[PDB]
Amino acid sequence: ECCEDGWCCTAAP
Ligand SMILES: *[C@@H]1O[C@H](CO)[C@H](O)[C@H](O[C@@H]2O[C@H](CO)[C@H](O)[C@H](O)[C@H]2O)[C@H]1NC(C)=O
DSSP states (O other): OOTTTTSSOSOOO
16 A cells, blocks of 8 residues: 555655
8 A cells, every 4th residue: 555556655754
């Protein structure tokens, strides 16, 4: 879910 949904991954620490 999310990062496999393609619209979630990023830096954001
Ligand atoms: C993932 O992290 C990076 C920031 O170090 C990249 O530039 C981008 O940054 C975030 O996304 C928006 C920046 O325009 C938000 O405003 C957020 O505050 C910011 O940290 C991120 N990548 C993506 C694709 O969103």
